[PDB]
């Protein structure tokens, strides 16, 4: 959380040039998505050097997940039910990369069926 | 005046098969499906679908 999520974001943003998603914080610190959004918002502040491009999305009443691009005119302002920083981007092009995640204890909604081996 | 059309085309154009389908494709640029005689008499028999009789005609 404090002094740890900030260090992880700084490392993953500058030591290696990779976009940082809040799901990365979820997998790293084993914390809920709301807390991850809170930490992303906290890191968004107290930063004098704006060397990253924040990517935000708006959740509407009709469940219209929309990536904000114009950043000046957001249609249906009264219809927005949630707004958060989706990711931190060090470059103009987003193009994230995905891999295998060992979600041992990071699940917030587990399925009814359990996995059986042999 | 009797005329043999295949011989007339044989004298006129330098084809390699001089069949009705070959001549039609090479001269009139039309492709005609060719059916064997057994197929034609099978589709021409009565109590058959209207499509087969139309096809033969």
């Amino acid at each position: 959380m404090d002094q740890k999520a900030s260090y992880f974001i700084n490392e993953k943003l500058f030591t290696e040039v990779k976009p940082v998603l809040f799901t990365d914080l979820i997998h790293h610190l084993k914390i809920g998505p709301s807390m991850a959004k809170k930490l992303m918002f906290d890191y968004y502040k107290q930063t004098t050097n704006a060397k990253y491009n924040c990517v935000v999305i708006c959740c509407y009443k009709d469940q219209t997940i929309k990536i904000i691009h114009d950043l000046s005119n957001i249609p249906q302002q009264d219809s927005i039910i949630d707004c958060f920083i989706y990711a931190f981007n060090p470059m103009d092009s987003f193009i994230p990369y995905y891999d295998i995640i060992d979600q041992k204890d990071c699940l917030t909604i587990k399925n009814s069926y359990e996995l059986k081996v042999s | 005046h009797m005329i043999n059309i295949w011989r007339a085309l044989r004298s006129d154009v330098n084809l390699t098969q001089y069949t009705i389908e070959s001549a039609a494709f090479n001269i009139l640029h039309k492709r005609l499906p060719h059916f064997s005689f057994e197929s034609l008499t099978n589709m021409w028999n009565a109590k058959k679908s209207t499509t087969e009789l139309k096809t033969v005609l």
């Binding site: - | 005046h1 009797m2 005329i3 009565a46 109590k47 209207t50 009789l53 139309k54 005609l57």
Partner: protein, 57 residues
């Protein structure tokens, strides 16, 4: 007053009925004539050739 195209089909009354109607519906543009036997069909062909009197066959 001639059609410039035609089809002659042999169809005895002992065969399946409604075959002439089915054939006429299938064509519906080119007239079709039906004859009891092949001899009458050949006689009709002779009559047609005499009536048209073509210079080339």
């Amino acid at each position: 007053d001639i059609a410039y195209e035609g089809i002659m089909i042999v169809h005895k009354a002992s065969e399946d009925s409604t075959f002439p109607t089915k054939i006429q519906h299938c064509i519906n543009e080119i007239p079709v004539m039906f004859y009891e036997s092949e001899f009458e069909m050949f006689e009709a062909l002779t009559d047609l050739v005499l009536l048209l009197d073509p210079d080339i066959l």
